[PDB]
Design a protein around this ligand. Structure first.
Ligand code: BOG
Ligand code: NA
Ligand code: NA
Lengths: 409, 407
């Protein structure tokens, strides 16, 4: 079978997809989108699942979809309608945030209340440790390339450790303009480019540390750091918790201190608070979880088709794949992994998991990247932690940036 | 604490309040993402409270349609009264139209309803039961046009605004998608159609439950996993895509008549059923999905329907003591149509008129329960559902034909 469909059945769908493709007729909406994404994701998911060299553990299926889908966009295999349809689902409909919102809610409302605050105290410093590692290693390789320290921090390290595109590139160019006075484009173009390259390496290393994790069990924790109506309620909660966090980060409490708190960061606090309040009955708490499983196990391959389209512009990467950037960026990511591994080990967490959540999930392209990374190491259950790095840890990088930027001038 | 437990859409009062307060915060501060998440957040919560309210009300629940009706009317009143903000209207509309949740919803419904029907029962049903249903529609048509001409009302209106909606598969299944076909063939507003259609259809549903008890007196007097569900979602979308491709590029029109893509879908999905390409496990998966929509997300959709597809003025204008007559006689035409057709096919006239007649003019599934309870024949639920579901899919095909040639 292909995604739970007998070969004959899948062919029916596959033929349908080709008919829509060749006649160039496809609704640019949810239905048209999911139809393509389901089918396309299905075949390449299975392929990735069975390619011997290509698939290793969890990373064999999602990574395949992701990379192949981006190659379809770059190669111009997708039609403008098809790209629009997938994009309409990812961004206009904003399936990405929904997906993450459901994950966060499902992951948090599953755990004990007492265990909650035990982590968050030790996590943030581990993230700082990863940044130090990312810095130290970056400057080390940078001097090896004859590149001044300032550039390494401004154009390499800070953007990579940034909260991704919307959260880091978009605001880090703002801070750059505010401190330097120079054009935002000059910065963002270089930043967005390099950050995407590191995001690629982050997804690669996530699978590497997964193999290493199952090979050296003492480092790994194996995915641990330290009726329909119920499922329907989980979906209400996933959206409603997102709405509240949204309202807080926009109009009530956009920033606690010098740090600006992203709405996803707030959501994590909100959902965790809702858990500790015990407002949700155990049945409903499970409903959230079962819904989160439906997304993480059924719709994950669909999301990846979208991730490969919207959030991986292969053109811009190639415009900056000078050997130099490729090496520097990659080693910065390694510095993050070793930074978070050391820091987490000292804090109490498993080195493998630490390096993934506080390391790779920091160097990745924020939320889209979190999904891409966590899916490569099958530790999708850490979405809540990955988001803390991308959102709260991302907010930290801006504060650091404003400091770093001023000193360099 | 006894009352703290009372549930609103499966949520204890205290929990719902959390959400209800969140909705008001988004409303007061005027901060809401105009996307899927923002939309569903509002629609879920709003639909929840008014769904229950409509559900609890005695006379309104059983004879008007209850919660789905309460939702789509109240929601339209929010738009008219200006209670919604321009953001909130945009968010809901973005879900309904730009994201096009409507079509997905319907696509899932059609697929789940058709593929749930056993392969044998479907093709068996077609030879005898299905033609009887067609005969009931003919009867419903002929009688409707007869009364319509007696009311000085053109034949177009009688078929489009009276007969077809009544014989339709109810509200979410017939009224909602018939408005789409109407817009796709005429070009006029959906809300003009739906507001009148939904109104008359509910009235006929009332007469259908009445006549069910009449024919009863007359009768006695004159003697297994999420993956399967996921596959259902693939199929629901893919079957829609194929029907889309057909109606746009391949086979836009059989003749002078234009076949709407939803019409084609029904044929496609029914063909897919008869091919038996889908294993029974997957066929159920499609059903279990259609359930999730029909029982969880139906109330959400109605919040949308009230916003875009509801003109509360036209609904008020349609409760004229003229339409009460027209609708009622259309139902009688269905009863006599199904009685004749069934008698020729081999079935009992009383039972035929109930299953292939009244169960067609009633409000889909909710109606079947209401009708088959009035006459003690609840054991015909399996037949009643064939009319409401397969017969309801037939009505869309006929509609797509009737609409085009009439325009
Ligand atoms: C304020 C909340 C911060 C902590 C959020 C993490 C809780 C949700 O995340 C959970 O963490 C657990 C403990 O590692 C893991 O067992 C689960 O895999 C994960 O779902
Ligand atoms: Na980053
Ligand atoms: Na009906």
């Amino acid at each position: 079978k292909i995604f739970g469909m007998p070969l004959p059945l899948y062919a029916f769908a596959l033929i349908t997809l080709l008919l829509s493709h060749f006649y160039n007729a496809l609704p640019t909406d949810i239905v048209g989108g999911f139809a393509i994404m389901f089918i396309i994701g299905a075949i390449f998911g299975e392929i990735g699942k069975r390619l011997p060299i290509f698939n290793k553990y969890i990373g064999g299926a999602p990574v395949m979809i992701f990379l192949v889908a981006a190659y379809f966009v770059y190669a111009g295999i997708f039609t403008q309608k098809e790209i629009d349809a997938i994009s309409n689902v990812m961004d206009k409909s904003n399936f990405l945030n929904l997906f993450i919102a459901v994950l966060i809610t499902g992951a948090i409302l599953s755990v004990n209340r007492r265990l909650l605050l035990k982590s968050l105290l030790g996590y943030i410093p581990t993230i700082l440790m990863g940044i130090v590692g990312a810095s130290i290693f970056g400057i080390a390789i940078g001097l090896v390339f004859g590149i001044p320290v300032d550039r390494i921090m401004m154009l390499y390290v800070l953007p990579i450790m940034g909260g991704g595109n919307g959260a880091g590139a978009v605001p880090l160019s703002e801070i750059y303009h505010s401190v330097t006075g120079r054009s935002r484009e000059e910065y963002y173009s270089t930043a967005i480019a390099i950050l995407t390259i590191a995001n690629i390496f982050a997804i690669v290393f996530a699978a590497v540390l997964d193999i290493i994790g199952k090979k050296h069990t003492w480092l790994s924790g194996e995915g641990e750091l330290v009726t329909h109506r119920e499922t329907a309620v989980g979906l209400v909660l996933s959206t409603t918790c997102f709405l509240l966090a949204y309202v807080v980060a926009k109009k009530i409490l956009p920033s606690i201190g010098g740090v600006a708190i992203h709405y996803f960061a707030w959501m994590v606090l909100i959902v965790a608070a809702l858990n500790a309040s015990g407002l949700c009955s155990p049945e409903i708490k499970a409903g959230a979880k079962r819904l989160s499983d439906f997304f993480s196990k059924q719709l994950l391959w669909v999301l990846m088709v979208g991730v490969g389209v919207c959030y991986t512009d292969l053109q811009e990467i190639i415009n900056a794949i000078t050997f130099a950037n490729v090496v520097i960026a990659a080693i910065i990511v390694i510095g993050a992994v070793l930074g978070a591994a050391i820091g987490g080990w000292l804090m109490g967490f498993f080195p493998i998991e630490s390096a993934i959540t506080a390391g790779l999930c920091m160097a990745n392209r924020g939320g889209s990247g979190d999904l891409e990374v966590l899916s490569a190491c099958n530790r999708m259950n850490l979405i809540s932690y990955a988001q803390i790095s991308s959102r709260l840890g991302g907010g930290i990088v801006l504060v650091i940036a404003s400091i770093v930027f001023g000193m360099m001038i």
